Design a binder for these strands. Sequence first.
DNA 1: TCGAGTAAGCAGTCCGCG
DNA 2: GCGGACTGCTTAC
Length: 901
Amino acid sequence: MKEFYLTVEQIGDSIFERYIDSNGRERTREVEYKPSLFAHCPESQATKYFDIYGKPCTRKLFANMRDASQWIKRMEDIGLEALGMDDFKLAYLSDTYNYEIKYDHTKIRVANFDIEVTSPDGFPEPSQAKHPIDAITHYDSIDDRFYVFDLLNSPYGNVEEWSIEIAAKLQEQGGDEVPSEIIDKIIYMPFDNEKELLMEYLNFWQQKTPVILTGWNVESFAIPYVYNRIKNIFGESTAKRLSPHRKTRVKVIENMYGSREIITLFGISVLDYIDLYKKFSFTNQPSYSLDYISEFELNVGKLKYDGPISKLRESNHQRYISYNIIAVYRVLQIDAKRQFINLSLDMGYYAKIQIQSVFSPIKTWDAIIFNSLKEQNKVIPQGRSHPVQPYPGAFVKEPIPNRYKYVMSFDLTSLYPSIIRQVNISPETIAGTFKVAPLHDYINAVAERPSDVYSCSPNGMMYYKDRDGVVPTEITKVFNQRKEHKGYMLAAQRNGEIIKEALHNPNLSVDEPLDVDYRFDFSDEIKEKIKKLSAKSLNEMLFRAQRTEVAGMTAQINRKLLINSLYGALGNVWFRYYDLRNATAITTFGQMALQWIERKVNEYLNEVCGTEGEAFVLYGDTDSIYVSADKIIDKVGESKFRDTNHWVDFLDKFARERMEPAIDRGFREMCEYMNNKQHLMFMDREAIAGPPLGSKGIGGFWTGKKRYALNVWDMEGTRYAEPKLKIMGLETQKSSTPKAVQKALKECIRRMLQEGEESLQEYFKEFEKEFRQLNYISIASVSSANNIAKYDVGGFPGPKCPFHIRGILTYNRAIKGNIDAPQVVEGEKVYVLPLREGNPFGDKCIAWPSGTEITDLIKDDVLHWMDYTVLLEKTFIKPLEGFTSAAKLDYEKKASLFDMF
DNA sequence: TCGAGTAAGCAGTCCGCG
DNA sequence: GCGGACTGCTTAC
Ligand SMILES: O=c1ccn([C@H]2C[C@H](O)[C@@H](COP(=O)(O)NP(=O)(O)OP(=O)(O)O)O2)c(=O)[nH]1
Ligand SMILES: [Ca+2]
Ligand SMILES: [Ca+2]
Ligand SMILES: [Ca+2]
Ligand SMILES: [Ca+2]
Ligand SMILES: [Ca+2]
């Protein structure tokens, strides 16, 4: 078995490494690693080492890591570049694992934990840790066991042992419904006192030391709480046993508004699942409580209990412990679906970094590029300081606000990475500059050809064509990986639609789901068997197909994120290869590419229609164009189509056989114009959209840039069983829009696009009539809440106080004096409701922590005084008015001459 | 919100606009 | 009442 690292740290002049040896055993070692760094040397001196620009370097081998660090400092004192990898543990990993790492996840100890702390006087601050830890559940991936540490005796109450038999039974039996599949995996340990609990936990931790440590808010709460509580009870040395090297650091995390403290445990890789979720999920959620996210991801019900959490252990210890266990399991269930741990491991081992560095694309790419260069005996440049400077981005076309009946969209494959590769954009491939014409002149192909020697971008930059830069070389590798996983994702998606179709005609039989790989398009044999299956089996297959789609989505979209972040890093001052010339080369080329192909598509369609000067491209943003297909449909005549699927087939074939070849020709000419290294502008059909055949639906509409809705029948080769709304930017897509209002606005849009004006009118009339019955949470707005203190002047709104902050200040006055009441936390999200004039809260709105019921003391008053009229006008009527005016229709029936009959 | 980038939309404050 | 200048927040890419 090939060896692989688990964790690596630098502690003074030593590297401390945990690793899996060639026999599959976990080991630890301390290595007196002697790092090398580099200085430029005379061309006369014979070396094998060259910088990225081809300048020769001499290697300097240091007696230890502190000597190397001191040398860097002195080189700055002299004013000379100190070249090489200054993060010595990355150099250590590069030397020690000089091959593509194959890791075995079954040997990696992944721990998932959660603690409970009863607190009568508000939130238990981890820096203080003044309250007993009364429960820990710690799941270990190697053992596949939930270890439960339960405090029976506390100053806040003495309790009886938790019962696994009660835990297992249904809620209807008085049980806790702990999932049957984990019941046999629970190892329950009760304790007579907190000191014994914590000592045993540390002994357990020593035996089963996490490599990856995760859970929900573990970095901000659980870890600092446990560390500080042990520190308070036993002293520092004992608390440091949470580190396998007995080293910890209090780390100050800073933002624009303030700072917070976390505990760095040397030799452990903390991947807090909340942070993995925020980075890798591509959602923006109204709440990030585990109950909220679990309900969203898994469709599990919120865990119900009577009274406040501060009294739960005393009143119902049985439920208290069961809920602690379930909380740990829910994170495991979310990871089973989303697979963010798998992603982090893949990425981390690929780059040869500490696994926790997957949060930083700058660190990830620094390591990838370093390792790549090192293989050629090339030497990385020193990082330099740069002032933050703005630079230009993508082009977005201003659409004419209107309905658009038939629409075909086209999109460039992985645009910015493709530009990097096509143009050959890299720190070491810069060849020089040329005199720039206005962008318009390049778009229309009237400007002089930039170069007959080098590969060009319309920002004035020229690049070598003789060899690929390291940035193109390395970005291509990850792009190719992304392509494979996107293939699996789309196959799974297409497979899901086959099952959805079959579910229209389920067979009356007792069946089992088919044992199949959803990552590959179903064979004819599989399709024939699916048509014979029961609804139970089909639904189970659909669930499995959709789970496979999600797995593929995680793998593909986050590889996309990584490569797009390499582009972004070029425009971040902390990146070793920061260069606004290269960042701007990419974006400016993109602006040209979009507008160039806009022209070419307009030219092609005008030719085939026999018309002159009309605009077929109605919209474009960054790398995509939207083409009006009305005239193409009208050339055949709607009466000649059998059904909706018939004109969809026709447009699909037209896009693939006619437009794509023309688009390809257009881009090949642009490549020659810019003298680029390799043609990689691949623009393929994305969406086919329109109303159902024979209906009064409008098909689609735009209100402005980044704000549109389309009724889509086929998306990237997936032919839907039922049409899918593609809605971008509109209020249905915003986390700030109330839940029930998103739902209502979506139905309004559906009716507009699929059914027409009259259908829209009847739904509006009903919503307006009934909406006051909707649950208050479902009609509350949502907002992040920053700078509460800034706008707080004696408990009242200061100058220019934002609406949501005003609401928080109102809440704060209403709960004043109560240490029990939930506090609004700076930087988190709040629900917001408007209040009718003359209300007892003394202001026009109130806000409270999102994902929660408002506290009982003020709930009745909030409900009594909620301003339904303002709520409706602001969240529903205003956006709907926007949609309908753009689409040129009315949400309320206009008076007619027929009324007088 | 510690963690790659820019474009650009809407809500709301403040206050001009005879 | 609406718009511009501005802050705040959130989305598309
Ligand atoms: O998070 C992002 C998204 C997009 N972009 C830029 C780069 C990207 O190539 C371009 C187009 O984004 P898309 O969302 O269309 N995806 P892309 O073309 O990169 O990939 P895909 O192949 O999926 O379309 O906009 C970013 O820089 N960061
Ligand atoms: Ca694209
Ligand atoms: Ca694409
Ligand atoms: Ca059937
Ligand atoms: Ca796109
Ligand atoms: Ca193609």
